[PDB]
Amino acid sequence: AMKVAVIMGSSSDWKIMQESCNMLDYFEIPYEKQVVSAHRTPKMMVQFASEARERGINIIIAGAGGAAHLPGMVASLTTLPVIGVPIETKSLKGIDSLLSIVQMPGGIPVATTAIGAAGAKNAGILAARMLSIQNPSLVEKLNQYESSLIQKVEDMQNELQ
Amino acid sequence: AMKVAVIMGSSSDWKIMQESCNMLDYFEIPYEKQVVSAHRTPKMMVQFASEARERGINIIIAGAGGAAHLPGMVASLTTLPVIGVPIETKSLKGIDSLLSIVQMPGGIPVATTAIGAAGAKNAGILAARMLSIQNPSLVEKLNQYESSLIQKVEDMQNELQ
Amino acid sequence: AMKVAVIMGSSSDWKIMQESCNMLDYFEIPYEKQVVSAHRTPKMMVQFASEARERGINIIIAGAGGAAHLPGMVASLTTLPVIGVPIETKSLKGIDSLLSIVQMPGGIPVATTAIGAAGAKNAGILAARMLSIQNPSLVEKLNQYESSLIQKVEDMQNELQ
Amino acid sequence: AMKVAVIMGSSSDWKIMQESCNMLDYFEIPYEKQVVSAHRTPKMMVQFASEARERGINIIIAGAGGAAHLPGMVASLTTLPVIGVPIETKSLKGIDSLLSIVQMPGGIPVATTAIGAAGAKNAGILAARMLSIQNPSLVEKLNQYESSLIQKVEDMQNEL
Amino acid sequence: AMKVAVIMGSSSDWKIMQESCNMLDYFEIPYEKQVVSAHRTPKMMVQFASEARERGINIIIAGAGGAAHLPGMVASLTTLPVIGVPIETKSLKGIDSLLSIVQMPGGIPVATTAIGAAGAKNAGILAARMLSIQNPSLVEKLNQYESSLIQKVEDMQNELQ
Amino acid sequence: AMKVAVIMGSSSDWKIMQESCNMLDYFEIPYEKQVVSAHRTPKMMVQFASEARERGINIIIAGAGGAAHLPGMVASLTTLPVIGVPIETKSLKGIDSLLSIVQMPGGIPVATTAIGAAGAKNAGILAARMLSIQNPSLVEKLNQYESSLIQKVEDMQNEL
Amino acid sequence: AMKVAVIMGSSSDWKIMQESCNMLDYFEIPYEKQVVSAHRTPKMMVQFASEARERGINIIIAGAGGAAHLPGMVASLTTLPVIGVPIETKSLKGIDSLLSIVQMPGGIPVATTAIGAAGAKNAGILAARMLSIQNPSLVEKLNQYESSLIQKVEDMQNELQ
Amino acid sequence: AMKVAVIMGSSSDWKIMQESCNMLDYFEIPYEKQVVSAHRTPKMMVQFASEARERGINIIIAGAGGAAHLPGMVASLTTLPVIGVPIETKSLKGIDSLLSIVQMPGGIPVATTAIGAAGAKNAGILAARMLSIQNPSLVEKLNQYESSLIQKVEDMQNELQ
């Protein structure tokens, strides 16, 4: 069965990270969500990452802000693909988040999304694309999603009043 | 049967993108490679991206620098996951490459790697992690890879002379 | 007959891109406006750009933000001059938009203006200057616009309180 | 007859700006090249820009680096379209050049291209596209140029 | 007799440049203030800069935003010292203004101060320091201003509630 | 008996981190050095950091570049003060390193120094300052160090 | 007895710097707080820094913004550890503050924390960790704080709604 | 007599700062030069700044890199105009130097010039313009310098014929 984990260091991250869960629901991909802090709960992060695959999780989506270490550290402790969402910060508006997630050393990858809500939405969509390789029923849903994007642009044509 | 496409806009990007191919070889994942330019051959890009899935491609790794539109445009034209590698730029150090790739709108994701050779290496490893959901024999190889990372660090212990 | 096209990937961009249309109206230059999304409607973008010259469009003004690919992709698909307007973004302050548009490779130019409303207004004025080469009636209008700018400065003198 | 002016503040900019001239020659578009400095010869710059249109210039391509004021000041003094090429600098890699040129407030436009040689090459090509409006001969030349760009990529298929 | 001119391209800049005038008033230094746009009124800019010294202007303080050319062009057209104040821009927060002003080539100097109100206030104070060389009675006022700065800090001590 | 640990994710960081050890030797402060990688040896990192205090370590100096997670993760796992040295990166000039180290959210601190060799030298000096609290012998050494800095400047006066 | 000093150039900085004092209170570490401006009260700064150790201060936490010189100058005038907190600035969002503080030359260190409230809170915690070396009672309090952070994360699990 | 002081933290800065002295010599303006380190010799810095005016110094030119505090701290301690030259740094290309110098909060000004050699050259010229208010023989020399700049450009025009 398909399963994604959606994780973040604080419940304050939820307004953003819920966008990943919204897309997973749209594609009918099961997920778990939880607060896992790289800095406040480092041992609970290590346990989560290490145990994820054997628990049946296929992909981890992880959001973090500032000195954003959660995605990279989780990726270092699992063989699963990890998608990292940079969360926008008060001062640097997510530039710190972006660089601290994307610039991983050769050897340990993180699939980095856009900063903020767009990135959280894209993490869910990216997870659906990844899962569509082994789960062919998703391909049709992905085709229909693409059609919905075309429809959205058509719907916007009369909004340049 | 697993297959990854490794693409880039120029042959001058090959010195970097060869790292992706190197890692795909390490995991025994079949690949094809070619030059696909978003700006010099936009129609060929459209055809390549649109037809990749039906031909048997599972993942596209796309490298580009500067006004680095290739990964995001390819992603817009396929239901496959696309991994985008920002190439370092002589002037702006790959900052233009990075922002052009990572900041995709909600709706069309690109899995963005680190700038340069690190990102290309990571694109290959990430593709293996993605394919390990569908192809379970890759998990053992990914575990072996972890072990080799640990050994690399052990070998460095006496080099602090 | 003169004709300009003003395009953007979202009706959310209209608040900015209307500035281009406002200046086209000032110079009495006919135009069309449309939503054309590089990522949500890539095939329609290809058709729009490819057909533009045959449809009698002389200049394309294209606005985009973030991973701002619309102007450069349109420019790759027509030999008309394309003016690219970077739209301000809520993390990188349009720096992503700007670099994505201006850093086009040798071979495929985009005439880039300032981030935001200033750039959209200036795209309209720039289109007027471009069209004045082969439409001499515009030269008088451009001279009169100079006079209006000088007058606007005079009208500001009493505001330094 | 068509005519483009290619200008720059220093002879040190010539290697870069010749890329503009090379593309103008490729498209058989006449041009003049000159050194015109916004900061060292401000009055000459004013005269050049003010008189350009009456002297038969259709487009001005202006390269500048650092506190790059030449394109914007020329644009403020002519009704002609001005294309600005940011020249790479040593400290800031042309970022100062780029922002000084592109960020014109509403009212006076500059068409800005990429930093350095790529931008210089593109200024010449952009000038050709501007002059191609309802001009089938130039449209043909631009289409042939497209064909060379496609060929360039197809040739690279074996260089991996 | 001492005189300073305070100039800017738009009345939108006045809410910043007013701090220059406020400090000049505090030091009892006569000034004039005017809108002079490098882009909208280039010929009047040339005239203003060229005539300033013979008119008895001692120093020009010039504010500009974005592609901020006013201070550098004025400096090129006068032998007077020119103080340049970068104005914060909506998108790039005055980094464009700052680089456009400060990065003048060797040969034509601009005395650059901080982005925004701090820079405008400091331009007025700097002008007083410059004028104090040939106008000795200003030294006493500058000493009194320093005393006022020490008092301001003392007044803040009970505000750490 | 005070002890400092100097750690880094690669021996290729030793180029920079040796400067920390050099200053510790200058102040006669005992130390150990080790390669500890946040991404390649995360489980070892956890052991090193969580056990540091029981191992007799008083201060940890950690260098890292790029996605520079080592100092912050180490800090999250110990009650010891952690000094983080950002290592210059070929592309982003250590700005990625700096932001990934300094921008710790409220709750877990890292004492961050300058990018590169300056920062590594300063991490060693900062550790000395930390150990000097109410320690007159180290205070004396720091005073002598101050005098050497003054002398260095005096020595440069005839070089203008 | 333990003692920390918390200083800042302006009472405007207090709403941020009070977080340092809040954490020192949490750990029962005695402190003094004062406005000390590197630029408005340079002589008083020099005296404060020079006398701090003699007066029994163990650690100085100093906040500063813009051309942020307070932490580096204080550090040059004491052999005590100095913690520098970059204050968020209106225009550059504390990037100026950060670079001005962190980029100290080899020879004179400043322990730099994050921009804004995070850095101020962390300066107090960092001072507690520093003092725990020679004040063993603080180790227990630091252990308590660690446990509290874990409990706070556990309390957030039901807030993803 | 007129007198300028040219100061810097290290003899490593002399290759750059000598450009200021070159221009002072061009205008026959007397000067002294000294190494003054804000961080290694802070008390000498305080003394130098505080005593400069009574000794006959009219203007201080100060160069500094990195956490470049010398110009701002000197300015805080004198009523003289202070010109600050940002010295290029290895990692950050003088961006740290620039922001640490130019971003002075309102109250204490520094006249900032370009990064590196251009800025040092311009500090000397700016000092001449400042001194020309009080010393009218300089106006003639500044007019001569204007003419020399025109000739330099004419020389380039003629060489490229």
Coordinates of N, CA and C in Angstrom, one line a residue, chain F residues 28-108:
Chain F
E28 N 47.8 26.8 25.4 CA 48.0 25.6 26.1 C 46.7 24.9 26.7
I29 N 45.7 24.9 25.8 CA 44.4 24.4 26.2 C 44.3 23.0 25.5
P30 N 44.2 21.9 26.4 CA 44.1 20.6 25.8 C 42.9 20.4 24.9
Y31 N 43.1 19.6 23.8 CA 42.0 19.3 22.9 C 42.2 18.0 22.3
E32 N 41.0 17.5 21.7 CA 41.0 16.4 20.8 C 40.4 16.9 19.5
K33 N 40.8 16.2 18.4 CA 40.2 16.5 17.1 C 39.7 15.2 16.4
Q34 N 38.6 15.3 15.7 CA 38.0 14.1 15.1 C 37.2 14.5 13.8
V35 N 37.1 13.6 12.9 CA 36.2 13.7 11.8 C 34.8 13.2 12.2
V36 N 33.8 14.0 12.2 CA 32.4 13.6 12.5 C 31.5 14.3 11.4
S37 N 30.9 13.5 10.6 CA 30.1 14.0 9.5 C 28.6 13.9 9.8
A38 N 27.9 15.0 9.8 CA 26.4 15.0 10.1 C 25.7 14.1 9.1
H39 N 26.1 14.1 7.8 CA 25.3 13.5 6.8 C 25.8 12.1 6.4
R40 N 27.2 11.9 6.5 CA 27.8 10.6 6.2 C 27.8 9.6 7.4
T41 N 28.0 10.2 8.6 CA 28.0 9.4 9.8 C 27.0 10.0 10.9
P42 N 25.7 10.1 10.5 CA 24.8 10.7 11.5 C 24.7 10.0 12.8
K43 N 24.8 8.7 12.8 CA 24.7 7.9 14.1 C 25.9 8.2 15.0
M44 N 27.1 8.2 14.4 CA 28.3 8.6 15.1 C 28.2 10.0 15.7
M45 N 27.8 10.9 14.9 CA 27.5 12.3 15.3 C 26.7 12.3 16.6
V46 N 25.6 11.5 16.6 CA 24.7 11.5 17.7 C 25.4 10.9 18.9
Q47 N 26.2 9.9 18.8 CA 27.0 9.4 19.9 C 28.0 10.4 20.4
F48 N 28.7 11.0 19.5 CA 29.7 12.0 19.9 C 29.1 13.1 20.6
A49 N 28.1 13.7 20.1 CA 27.4 14.9 20.7 C 26.8 14.6 22.1
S50 N 26.0 13.5 22.1 CA 25.2 13.2 23.3 C 26.2 12.8 24.5
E51 N 27.3 12.2 24.2 CA 28.3 11.8 25.2 C 29.4 12.7 25.4
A52 N 29.5 13.8 24.7 CA 30.6 14.8 24.8 C 30.9 15.2 26.3
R53 N 29.9 15.6 27.0 CA 30.1 16.1 28.3 C 30.6 15.0 29.3
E54 N 30.0 13.8 29.2 CA 30.5 12.7 30.0 C 31.9 12.2 29.6
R55 N 32.2 12.5 28.3 CA 33.6 12.2 27.9 C 34.6 13.3 28.3
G56 N 34.2 14.3 29.1 CA 35.2 15.3 29.6 C 35.4 16.5 28.7
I57 N 34.6 16.6 27.7 CA 34.7 17.8 26.8 C 34.0 18.9 27.4
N58 N 34.6 20.1 27.3 CA 34.0 21.4 27.9 C 33.3 22.3 26.8
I59 N 33.9 22.3 25.6 CA 33.5 23.1 24.5 C 33.7 22.3 23.2
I60 N 32.8 22.5 22.3 CA 32.9 21.8 21.0 C 33.0 22.9 19.9
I61 N 34.0 22.8 19.1 CA 34.2 23.7 17.9 C 33.9 22.8 16.7
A62 N 32.9 23.2 15.9 CA 32.5 22.3 14.8 C 32.6 23.2 13.5
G63 N 33.2 22.7 12.5 CA 33.3 23.4 11.2 C 32.4 22.6 10.2
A64 N 31.7 23.4 9.3 CA 30.9 22.7 8.2 C 30.6 23.7 7.1
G65 N 30.4 23.2 5.9 CA 30.1 24.0 4.7 C 28.9 23.5 4.0
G66 N 28.3 24.4 3.2 CA 27.2 24.1 2.3 C 25.9 24.0 3.1
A67 N 25.3 22.9 3.0 CA 24.2 22.6 4.0 C 24.9 22.2 5.3
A68 N 25.3 23.2 6.0 CA 26.2 23.0 7.1 C 25.4 22.7 8.4
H69 N 25.1 21.4 8.6 CA 24.2 21.0 9.7 C 24.9 20.5 11.0
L70 N 26.2 20.3 10.8 CA 27.0 19.7 11.9 C 26.9 20.5 13.2
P71 N 27.3 21.8 13.2 CA 27.3 22.5 14.5 C 25.9 22.5 15.2
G72 N 24.8 22.8 14.4 CA 23.5 22.9 15.0 C 23.0 21.6 15.5
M73 N 23.2 20.5 14.8 CA 22.8 19.2 15.2 C 23.6 18.7 16.5
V74 N 24.9 19.0 16.5 CA 25.7 18.7 17.7 C 25.1 19.5 18.9
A75 N 24.8 20.8 18.7 CA 24.3 21.6 19.7 C 23.0 21.1 20.3
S76 N 22.2 20.5 19.4 CA 20.9 20.0 19.8 C 20.9 18.8 20.7
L77 N 22.1 18.2 20.7 CA 22.3 16.9 21.4 C 23.2 17.0 22.7
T78 N 23.6 18.2 23.0 CA 24.5 18.4 24.2 C 24.1 19.6 24.9
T79 N 24.5 19.7 26.2 CA 24.4 20.9 27.0 C 25.6 21.8 26.9
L80 N 26.6 21.3 26.3 CA 27.9 22.1 26.1 C 27.7 23.2 25.1
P81 N 28.5 24.3 25.3 CA 28.4 25.4 24.3 C 29.1 24.9 23.0
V82 N 28.5 25.2 21.9 CA 29.0 24.8 20.6 C 29.4 26.0 19.7
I83 N 30.6 26.1 19.2 CA 31.0 27.1 18.3 C 31.1 26.6 16.9
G84 N 30.3 27.2 16.0 CA 30.2 26.8 14.6 C 31.0 27.6 13.7
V85 N 31.9 27.0 12.9 CA 32.7 27.7 11.9 C 32.2 27.4 10.5
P86 N 31.7 28.5 9.8 CA 31.2 28.2 8.4 C 32.4 28.1 7.5
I87 N 32.4 27.1 6.7 CA 33.5 26.8 5.7 C 33.1 27.4 4.4
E88 N 34.0 28.2 3.8 CA 33.8 28.8 2.5 C 33.4 27.7 1.4
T89 N 32.4 28.0 0.6 CA 32.0 27.1 -0.4 C 32.4 27.7 -1.8
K90 N 32.8 26.9 -2.7 CA 33.3 27.3 -4.0 C 32.3 28.1 -4.8
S91 N 31.0 27.7 -4.7 CA 29.9 28.4 -5.4 C 29.5 29.6 -4.6
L92 N 28.9 29.4 -3.4 CA 28.2 30.5 -2.7 C 29.1 31.2 -1.7
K93 N 30.4 31.0 -1.7 CA 31.3 31.8 -0.9 C 31.1 31.7 0.6
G94 N 30.5 30.6 1.0 CA 30.2 30.4 2.4 C 28.9 31.0 2.9
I95 N 28.1 31.6 2.1 CA 26.9 32.2 2.5 C 25.9 31.1 2.9
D96 N 25.8 30.0 2.1 CA 25.0 28.9 2.5 C 25.5 28.3 3.9
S97 N 26.8 28.2 4.0 CA 27.4 27.7 5.3 C 27.0 28.6 6.4
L98 N 27.2 29.9 6.2 CA 26.9 30.9 7.3 C 25.4 30.8 7.7
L99 N 24.5 30.9 6.8 CA 23.1 30.9 7.1 C 22.6 29.6 7.7
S100 N 23.1 28.5 7.2 CA 22.8 27.2 7.8 C 23.3 27.0 9.2
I101 N 24.3 27.7 9.6 CA 24.8 27.7 11.0 C 24.2 28.7 11.9
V102 N 24.2 30.0 11.5 CA 23.9 31.1 12.4 C 22.4 31.1 12.7
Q103 N 21.5 30.8 11.7 CA 20.1 31.0 11.8 C 19.3 30.0 12.6
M104 N 19.9 29.5 13.7 CA 19.2 28.5 14.5 C 18.0 29.2 15.2
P105 N 16.8 28.6 15.1 CA 15.7 29.1 15.8 C 15.9 29.1 17.3
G106 N 15.1 30.0 18.0 CA 15.2 30.1 19.4 C 15.0 28.8 20.1
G107 N 15.9 28.5 21.0 CA 15.9 27.2 21.8 C 17.2 26.5 21.8
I108 N 17.9 26.4 20.6 CA 19.2 25.7 20.5 C 20.2 26.7 19.9

